[PDB]
Design a protein around this ligand. Sequence first.
Ligand SMILES: [Cd+2]
Ligand SMILES: [Cd+2]
Ligand SMILES: [Cd+2]
Ligand SMILES: [Cd+2]
Length: 37
Amino acid sequence: KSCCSCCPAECEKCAKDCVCKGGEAAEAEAEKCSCCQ
Ligand SMILES: [Cd+2]
Ligand SMILES: [Cd+2]
Ligand SMILES: [Cd+2]
Ligand SMILES: [Cd+2]
């Protein structure tokens, strides 16, 4: 069970809280996040 579609279900950054409240892309479908890279 995860809390997003850009990180695994064992991410450390997303352990305390989903820190993926970013992404300024309307026509750039990415398969990863910077905050957690
Ligand atoms: Cd994520
Ligand atoms: Cd993460
Ligand atoms: Cd998350
Ligand atoms: Cd992230």
